[PDB]
Amino acid sequence: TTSQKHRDFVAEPMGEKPVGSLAGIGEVLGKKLEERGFDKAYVVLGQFLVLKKDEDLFREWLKDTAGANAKQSRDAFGALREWADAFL
Amino acid sequence: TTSQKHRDFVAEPMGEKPVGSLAGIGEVLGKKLEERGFDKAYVVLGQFLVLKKDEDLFREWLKDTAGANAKQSRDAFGALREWADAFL
Amino acid sequence: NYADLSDTELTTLLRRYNIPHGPVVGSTRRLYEKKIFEYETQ
């Protein structure tokens, strides 16, 4: 479930976790993200940080570049925001 | 004061530290990074992460963005790499 | 003029030339265009 993926992602350092571990990143989004060079969850975290953790900027970027819908971009944004609040 | 800056940088999560907290990022480099929009150390961490922790890409980007020489870029990279091995 | 290339097309050139790279995003576009230019002209 989405809640379980979010809870598991924010619970611990991400290390070398694949991009698919991020809540909101299913098979389709994960494959598009991997095609763009976002193989690991940390690469997506990098873009979130370069965008200064801005929700509107990150969500617009994920929707336009990877084909994410509003729900998926919110779930992925939320997992990264809460992970950074806990560990960064 | 590079070794002191490196030790303090890699010891804890970076939170809201400014870019000048990074080993290698002195007054000239820090001011230039902030003028380019890399206003916090986490923004530079973000860039290191979107560059897949690649030393050559990171050091080339830093030289082009802030005018870092080889030594400054080697030190900034090393501090981010050791921090990411510990906390990311 | 690499501006006409999409991020996907820029990524494809970096891969074709075996130039190590990560994602093409707003903060890396300038770097990868410079690297492509230097590799093509030198």
Author numbering:
A (entry chain A), B (entry chain B): 2 to 89
C (entry chain G): 3 to 44
Lines quoted from the article behind this entry:
Barrier-to-autointegration factor (BAF), encoded by the BANF1 gene, is an abundant and ubiquitously expressed metazoan protein that has multiple functions during the cell cycle. Through its ability to cross-bridge two double-stranded DNA (dsDNA), it favours chromosome compaction, participates in post-mitotic nuclear envelope reassembly and is essential for the repair of large nuclear ruptures. Phosphorylation of BAF by the vaccinia-related kinase 1 (VRK1) is a key regulator of BAF localization and function. Here, we demonstrate that VRK1 successively phosphorylates BAF on Ser4 and Thr3.
We also verified that pBAF still interacts with the LEM domain of emerin. We observed by ITC that both BAF and pBAF bind with a Kd of about 1 μM to the purified LEM domain. We even obtained crystals of the complex between pBAF and EmN that diffracted at a resolution of 1.4 Å. Determination of the high-resolution structure of the complex confirmed that BAF and pBAF adopt similar 3D structures in the crystal. At this resolution, the two phosphorylated side-chains as well as the Lys72 side chain were unambiguously positioned, and a salt-bridge between the side chains of pThr3 and Lys72 was observed. On the emerin side, only the LEM domain is visible in the crystal, the disordered region of EmN being probably proteolyzed during crystallogenesis, as previously reported. The position of the LEM domain on pBAF is similar to that observed for the LEM domain on BAF, as illustrated in Figure 7B. Consistently, a salt-bridge is present between pThr3 and Lys72 side chains in the 3D structure of pBAF bound to the LEM domain of emerin. Determination of the high-resolution 3D structure of the complex between pBAF and the emerin LEM domain confirmed that BAF and pBAF bind similarly to this domain. At the opposite, its interface with emerin is distant from its phosphorylation sites and exhibits no chemical shift variation upon phosphorylation.
